């Protein structure tokens, strides 16, 4: 197999050609009719990656690759910009002024994906190591062969990709639309924004809270199975979105089966600058709290920084599998999300009780100090997406006698029967916690079959 560079491929041969390239963009594989699937992508290499820079505006130049197939599984799922693709038997032609490489996978063409970073996106999600640095993490057909001579091409193209992404935006401003101008678009458009929040709407759907350089916030539904790599704080490029004219309560982007959400390789200058430049916004949440009913979700808490890297565990696993799952039995500390259905005791004034550290007993302060040290003894009855349909509610405790969750309310325990200020703040927090669309993000510690909140604080 002889590999040719993009700009040097023949436009007249019409013969099958082969090449290595870096993917900067791609649709998701999508069905067109009763027998055809398609995946369109934008590719570049050392010979084709930037338009005549003078009056070009540092715009990216590229070739396009269109892969056809009879089966969905015979096409590449591109989750990240910057990785490399190897194509065999592609025919080149000029389509509206640009180099279009076409390859029928259902015939004799084939492709193979190589990770530019240490691990592929899927391997990062599963915390897996790559077999080797010359192994395709994905490819068409039952086999893929890498000859010794290719190793240099791959290694060099990788080095090039990192220099390219770290020196240029790659996804230039002409490749997407500012979110605050989304409503002026006639049809679909592309987006480049930071994921501010990933809210599990239900069993198969995530609701992404996005914010781009224009400062505009938008929400969009992202299927879990299709886009399992979405992560809070990360910058992504969204290929093909439309402005939703029917959403009045909040700004919504609509995605299609061919739409794609793509992250950037570690070296991406654009991704790095946007992660730092774009800062979290809570304006939407602050405004929603003034409404009797908010169609916008509000995460009322934040976990200590030392847990930000801790993976979350659903209520289903926490209460229904924590005593039968090997992996869940080995952990005592978990992170989870849920909404509060009810708070006990009902009387907010009883949330703080006097505790006797010698008899391990607590009591009401309605009789005053004669009960010992003041502590919070609150029981949340919660629910989440994973348990949304069942007839259950789950108990999550806030028992701070040992220091766990003492600062949850940003209100030091005190006799609520006498401290009006403390009582009032807790009463307000109570209405917020039980309000529809309010959610909690918290770390819990398992103790004698119960879960106690810790290292978690309200931010409203």
């Amino acid at each position: 197999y002889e590999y040719v560079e993009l700009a040097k491929a023949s436009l007249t041969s019409a013969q099958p050609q082969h090449f290595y390239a870096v993917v900067i963009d791609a649709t998701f594989p999508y069905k067109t009719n009763q027998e055809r699937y398609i995946c369109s992508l934008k590719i570049v290499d050392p010979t084709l990656y930037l338009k005549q820079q003078k009056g070009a505006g540092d715009a990216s130049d590229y070739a396009t690759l269109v892969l056809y197939a009879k089966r969905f599984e015979d096409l590449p799922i591109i989750h990240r910009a910057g990785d490399i693709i190897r194509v065999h038997r592609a025919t080149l032609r000029l389509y509206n002024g640009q180099r279009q490489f076409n390859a029928n996978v259902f015939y004799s063409s084939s492709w193979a994906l190589f990770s530019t970073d240490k691990r592929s996106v899927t391997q990062e999600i599963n915390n897996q190591d790559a077999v080797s640095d010359t192994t395709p993490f994905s490819f068409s057909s039952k086999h893929a062969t890498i000859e010794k001579n290719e190793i240099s091409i791959l290694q060099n193209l990788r080095k090039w990709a990192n220099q390219y992404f770290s020196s240029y935006s790659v996804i230039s401003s002409d490749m997407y639309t500012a979110l605050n101008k989304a409503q002026a678009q006639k049809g679909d458009f592309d987006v480049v924004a930071k994921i501010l929040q990933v809210h599990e709407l239900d069993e198969y759907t995530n609701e992404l809270k996005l914010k781009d350089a224009s400062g505009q916030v938008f929400y969009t539904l992202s299927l879990k199975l299709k886009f399992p790599h979405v992560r809070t704080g990360e910058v992504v490029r969204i290929r093909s979105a439309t402005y939703d004219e029917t959403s009045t309560q909040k700004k919504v982007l609509i995605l299609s089966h061919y739409s794609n959400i793509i992250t950037f390789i570690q070296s991406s200058k654009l991704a790095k600058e946007l992660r730092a430049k774009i800062q979290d916004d809570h304006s939407v949440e602050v405004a929603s709290l003034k409404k009797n009913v908010s169609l916008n979700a509000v995460v009322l808490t934040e976990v200590d920084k030392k847990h930000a890297a801790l993976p979350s565990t659903s209520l289903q696993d926490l209460f229904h599998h924590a005593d039968s799952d090997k992996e869940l039995q080995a952990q005592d500390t978990f992170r989870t999300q849920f909404y509060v259905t009810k708070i006990e005791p009902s009387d907010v004034k009883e949330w703080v009780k006097g505790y006797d550290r010698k008899t391990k007993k607590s009591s009401s302060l309605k009789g005053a100090s004669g009960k010992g040290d003041n502590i919070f003894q609150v029981q949340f009855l919660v629910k989440d997406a994973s348990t949304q349909l069942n007839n259950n509610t789950y108990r999550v405790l806030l028992y701070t006698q040992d220091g766990l969750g003492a600062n949850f309310f940003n209100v030091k325990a005190d006799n609520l029967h006498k401290n009006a200020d403390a009582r009032k703040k807790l009463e307000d927090s109570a209405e917020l916690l039980t309000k529809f669309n309010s959610y909690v993000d918290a770390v819990v510690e398992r103790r004698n079959g119960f879960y106690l909140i810790k290292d978690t604080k309200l931010i409203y």
Binding site: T248, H320, Y399
Partner: protein, 216 residues
Amino acid sequence: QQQSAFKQLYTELFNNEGDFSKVSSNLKKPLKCYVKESYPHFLVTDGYFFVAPYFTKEAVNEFHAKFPNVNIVDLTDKVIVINNWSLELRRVNSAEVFTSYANLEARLIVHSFKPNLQERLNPTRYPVNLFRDDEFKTTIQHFRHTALQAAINKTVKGDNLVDISKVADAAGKKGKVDAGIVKASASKGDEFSDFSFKEGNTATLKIADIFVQEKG
């Protein structure tokens, strides 16, 4: 101002405990919609979303009477006008019914519809399943949240707080997490169902039967 007629209708139905009589009257006017599909699923759009209309055995017989030269299962890409219709809530298995959410479905019961054969409609966005919309899914979650909260505040009582000693000095104590599971209502099964709206009931035809009635 809601531009999607379907979204506004279905939203008010849910925000009014499935009581179709409580929904705005100025919304119960004839519905002119485009037929996206007709078989195996009959789907119509309002220019923004698509919904599945449920035809009564009467509605079809009337149709076949006033329009003998028109097969319903062949109305794809054609427009229709539903003059007499109603809306009701039904409990379904959303895992099988794609035109629903959280085991709940708002059905468009059609009593009378006229096919405006060969009427070209204005260009619109690609229609999406109303039950896949962010705001509408949220509207439905609000509905369940309210029913759930009312049931829980009625079922749960006596502040049965875990005794603090169980979580204090738990060095030599081991427990099963299912000890934290609390029943939300007096529901019979393992699925919450303590809703206050009265599930609508109306005989409707299966799109398959109307297919046979027009081409055995």
